[PDB]
Design a protein around this ligand. Structure first.
Ligand SMILES: *[C@@H]1O[C@H](CO)[C@@H](O[C@@H]2O[C@H](CO)[C@@H](O)[C@H](O)[C@H]2NC(C)=O)[C@H](O)[C@H]1NC(C)=O
Ligand SMILES: *[C@@H]1O[C@H](CO)[C@@H](O[C@@H]2O[C@H](CO)[C@@H](O)[C@H](O)[C@H]2NC(C)=O)[C@H](O)[C@H]1NC(C)=O
Ligand SMILES: *[C@@H]1O[C@H](CO)[C@@H](O[C@@H]2O[C@H](CO)[C@@H](O)[C@H](O)[C@H]2NC(C)=O)[C@H](O)[C@H]1NC(C)=O
Ligand SMILES: *[C@@H]1O[C@H](CO)[C@@H](O[C@@H]2O[C@H](CO)[C@@H](O)[C@H](O)[C@H]2NC(C)=O)[C@H](O)[C@H]1NC(C)=O
Ligand SMILES: *[C@@H]1O[C@H](CO)[C@@H](O[C@@H]2O[C@H](CO)[C@@H](O)[C@H](O)[C@H]2NC(C)=O)[C@H](O)[C@H]1NC(C)=O
Ligand SMILES: *[C@@H]1O[C@H](CO)[C@@H](O[C@@H]2O[C@H](CO)[C@@H](O)[C@H](O)[C@H]2NC(C)=O)[C@H](O)[C@H]1NC(C)=O
Ligand SMILES: *[C@@H]1O[C@H](CO)[C@@H](O)[C@H](O)[C@H]1NC(C)=O
Lengths: 597, 167
């Protein structure tokens, strides 16, 4: 009767009704995605609109329970997740304008195209044809043209829209007592009222800037090695003491260096492990892969599959006419209905995507007993980390040689492991400075520390001094280079990709200690050990019912993200790089530019 | 027994049928019977109570259990001397687009005493101001429905339950 009994009584009814409506909407969306028909679009939109309407009604109904007299932490967590306004604190005018500019930016990014200077009737889009040039070409002039034109033709349409998107989002955040939009975004990692596991919104910035100063000694050696290797594919275009031109990095923005592996391979005469012929000669079909994945998952002590997972899932590309969206995902429809949607081939990368998606499914199966509103990872970076450690452990030669895809002897040498570690570092380490720098720029732009007449200037100085990458053409204040990225023009947060990379190696180093592993960390395999399975299930089964600082401690033993496991993972490559850079100049200077003469 | 075990339509949980009549080897010869437990034994009269509940709630039809079924819908005395059987009926009581004909009570002012039935449907008041027979804020409808469907995992599928009580 006090205030708490009424809250529990409200939350019961909400739980049941929301569960049912969400199942209906999710089944409609699955029916649309697995079998594309234009009546399925309406069948999905009806359920989506009715679910969103129910959600908004119950949200405006749950405001009448004051949060300052609820004493339970579960009830308070649910009520605080339900009471948030988000948008709709703005007028109808301003909300309409915000939705309009969001849709405009989305369609500008989706349907913008550039074309040739010598044939203006040859326009190419970004998706099929620009990031193919940026990925497969070795022509300096072609890469420079693509890089410059994408930014000068699409990047100039998004600046006047972004300049008011910033203001609208800022007042939307200030109306919810958040002091800016960046604080609203950081409000995901916040923990309150636990007296020992708390975590502030301004502490995330400090813990992100503190872990990055320990990665710099490895990123500098990787940068020096990559630069000394690029100085042989583009001679007279790279300076041996300067930064790297921004258009020579493998893709359009330099988010991943993984396409530079053909140029910077340590020992090109030792091929990497690739079990694809051994599968096709043994006639592995699209379901033996998933049987092996399920066997690996039950080997460590996790449950079997749901027995409804086999009939309702789509493990092969559909037939002649059932055109569907082929993108590997895991669906959690509710009421005990887990499915996987991927059009699998017989390859070695699908063999890893299987483990990734089934790790997602196991996570979703673990916390199926929590209330409806507490069914998610502890924060944004836990789900993909749990999915990634499985794909890490499932690709080691000790695993493939026991499954049967490798020869029973197969002596492995150190050159192959150097190749493997460099291929891993080109995509794991090469993306941390970029992510950190982009999110720092966005935080400072939303906070107001960068006036709107100094966006490009600050952007490129931060790119020079943090990432080590120089622009090939001067850019004035009529451009918008960040907005030419997907996550910026589509209003997505970018700090999850930073914390996930740290949680991943923390989890791996914590689970390899329970499986009694002795060698290097990049050879560890957690299969056939139930202690690792128990240690992981102790965390998977919590969901959002506990602060993330406690779920993280249940596995690792610490309360905040650490960066030592990543360096322990990359130690052999670090030693090799340090030995390879005896003559080069480790570091860069922030004054050289390709156009300075 | 072939009329309380073969009934084409079973009763809801909150209004459960209780059949009394004036060959045990026949029920023992049938479908797998997912659950079959009798605690007191291996009579003056026999009672047959029958209903349809969810899967993961079949664990509550037993003496000395708590939940939303052994509290407000069906309570068995701790001195039970009958035998409870339960079997899956997914292919009968489940339909696409939901089978909303099976209901249960999840709001009640007091727990049930053993072998008591309660079919009244007045509005439950959670706060302190009277409700006057109309839903709204802190006033709720006490009877909710199972949205039974065929694409449900076990434990969320319909299960037909029959309790045979002996004196
Ligand atoms: C994929 O969707 C299409 C369109 O909704 C389905 O086509 C019709 O489906 C209804 C529903 O059973 C049938 O009654 C019609 O005979 C179907 N017509 C045609 C021309 O196909 C199609 O059945 C769906 N795919 C599957 C596997 O159910
Ligand atoms: C309010 O908090 C209490 C404890 O602080 C919660 O009690 C737990 O309830 C679950 C399920 O009923 C039990 O499994 C736990 O053992 C209980 N905890 C303890 C310490 O006994 C209660 O669930 C909270 N309220 C709600 C609505 O969840
Ligand atoms: C959500 O928005 C509403 C208005 O858009 C805010 O205003 C309160 O709304 C409640 C519910 O109708 C009223 O009871 C209060 O009188 C309103 N004014 C207040 C609290 O000053 C509401 O505060 C917003 N909630 C949050 C969590 O931001
Ligand atoms: C996990 O352990 C099982 C059992 O110890 C291993 O399976 C056996 O492996 C040996 C050696 O390769 C074979 O001689 C047996 O025939 C296997 N038995 C079965 C039932 O498969 C399995 O190889 C181990 N897996 C890993 C990854 O270490
Ligand atoms: C891989 O291992 C081999 C064998 O240990 C290494 O070859 C030795 O390298 C050291 C380092 O200079 C030399 O002093 C030895 O003379 C080498 N062995 C022979 C037989 O000549 C090799 O250097 C290792 N490679 C890497 C990349 O670590
Ligand atoms: C429950 O009822 C069904 C049908 O109402 C019974 O199925 C019959 O089984 C006999 C035995 O072979 C057949 O000869 C009949 O043809 C079946 N009926 C139909 C309509 O096909 C079933 O045996 C009954 N079970 C019990 C335990 O009474
Ligand atoms: C999982 O299923 C396999 C058959 O698919 C069975 O042999 C095994 O015992 C099952 N394991 C568990 C824990 O249920």
């Amino acid at each position: 009767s006090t205030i708490e009994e009424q809250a529990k009584t409200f939350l019961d009814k909400f739980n049941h009704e929301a569960e049912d409506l969400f199942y209906q909407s999710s089944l409609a969306s699955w029916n649309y995605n697995t079998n594309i028909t234009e009546e399925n679009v309406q069948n999905m939109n009806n359920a989506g609109d009715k679910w969103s309407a129910f959600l908004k009604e119950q949200s405006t109904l749950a405001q009448m329970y004051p949060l300052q007299e609820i004493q339970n932490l579960t009830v308070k967590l649910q009520l605080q997740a339900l009471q948030q306004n988000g948008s709709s604190v703005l007028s109808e005018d301003k909300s309409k304008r915000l939705n309009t500019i969001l849709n405009t930016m989305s369609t500008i990014y989706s349907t913008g195209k550039v074309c040739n200077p010598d044939n203006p009737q040859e326009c190419l889009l970004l998706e099929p044809g620009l990031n193919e040039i940026m990925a497969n070409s070795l022509d300096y002039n072609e890469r420079l043209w693509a890089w410059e034109s994408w930014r000068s033709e699409v990047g100039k349409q998004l600046r006047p829209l972004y300049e008011e998107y910033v203001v609208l989002k800022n007042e939307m955040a200030r109306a919810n007592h958040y002091e800016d939009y960046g604080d609203y975004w950081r409000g995901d990692y916040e923990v309150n009222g636990v007296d020992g596991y708390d975590y502030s919104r301004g502490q995330l910035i400090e813990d992100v800037e503190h872990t990055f100063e320990e990665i710099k000694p490895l990123y500098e050696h990787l940068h020096a090695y990559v630069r000394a290797k690029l100085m042989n594919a583009y001679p007279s275009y790279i300076s041996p003491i300067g930064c790297l031109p921004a258009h020579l990095l493998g893709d359009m923005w330099g988010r991943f260096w993984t396409n530079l592996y053909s140029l910077t391979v340590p020992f090109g005469q030792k091929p990497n492990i690739d079990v694809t012929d051994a599968m096709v000669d043994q006639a592995w079909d699209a379901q033996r892969i998933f049987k092996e994945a399920e066997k690996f998952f039950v080997s460590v002590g996790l449950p079997n599959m749901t027995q409804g997972f086999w009939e309702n899932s789509m493990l092969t590309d559909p037939g002649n006419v059932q055109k569907a969206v082929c993108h590997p995902t895991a669906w959690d429809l509710g009421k005990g209905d887990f499915r996987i949607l991927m059009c699998t081939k017989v390859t070695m990368d699908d063999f890893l995507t299987a483990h990734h998606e089934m790790g997602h499914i196991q996570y979703d199966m673990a916390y199926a007993a929590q209330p409806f509103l507490l069914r998610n990872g502890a924060n944004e970076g836990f789900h993909e980390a749990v999915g990634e450690i499985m794909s890490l452990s499932a690709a080691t030669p000790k695993h493939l040689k026991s499954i049967g895809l490798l020869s029973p002897d197969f002596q492995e040498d150190n050159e192959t492991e150097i190749n493997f570690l460099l291929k891993q570092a080109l995509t794991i380490v090469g993306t941390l400075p970029f992510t950190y720098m982009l999110e720092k720029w966005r935080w400072m732009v939303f906070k107001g520390e960068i006036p709107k007449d100094q966006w490009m200037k600050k952007w490129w100085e931060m790119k020079r001094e943090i990432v080590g990458v120089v622009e090939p053409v001067p850019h004035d204040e009529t451009y918008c280079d960040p907005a030419s990225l997907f996550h910026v023009s589509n209003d997505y947060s970018f700090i999850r990709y930073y914390t996930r990379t740290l949680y991943q190696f923390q989890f791996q180093e914590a689970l390899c200690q329970a499986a009694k592993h002795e060698g290097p960390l990049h050879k560890c395999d957690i299969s056939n050990s139930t202690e690792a399975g128990q240690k992981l299930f102790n965390m998977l089964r919590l969901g959002k019912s506990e602060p993330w600082t406690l779920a993280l401690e249940n596995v690792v033993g610490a309360k905040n993200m650490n960066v030592r496991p990543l360096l322990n993972y990359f130690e052999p490559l670090f030693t090799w790089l340090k030995d390879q850079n005896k003559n080069s100049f480790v570091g860069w200077s922030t004054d050289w530019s390709p156009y300075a003469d | 027994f072939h009329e309380v075990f073969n009934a084409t339509r079973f009763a809801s949980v909150y209004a459960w049928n209780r059949k009394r009549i004036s060959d045990y080897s026949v029920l023992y010869n049938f479908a797998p019977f997912f659950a079959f437990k009798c605690y007191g034994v291996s009579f003056t009269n026999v009672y047959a109570d029958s209903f349809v509940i969810r899967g993961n709630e079949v664990s509550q039809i037993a003496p000395g259990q708590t939940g939303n079924i052994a509290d407000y819908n069906y309570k068995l005395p701790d001195d039970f001397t009958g035998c409870v059987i339960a079997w899956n009926s997914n292919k009968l009581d489940s339909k696409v687009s939901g089978n909303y004909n099976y209901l249960y009570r999840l709001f009640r002012k007091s727990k049930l005493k053993p072998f008591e039935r309660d079919i009244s449907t007045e509005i439950y008041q959670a706060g302190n101001k009277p409700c006057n027979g109309v839903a709204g804020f802190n006033c709720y409808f006490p009877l909710q429905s199972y949205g039974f469907r065929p694409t449900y995992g076990v434990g969320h599928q319909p299960y037909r339950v029959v309790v045979l009580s002996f004196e």
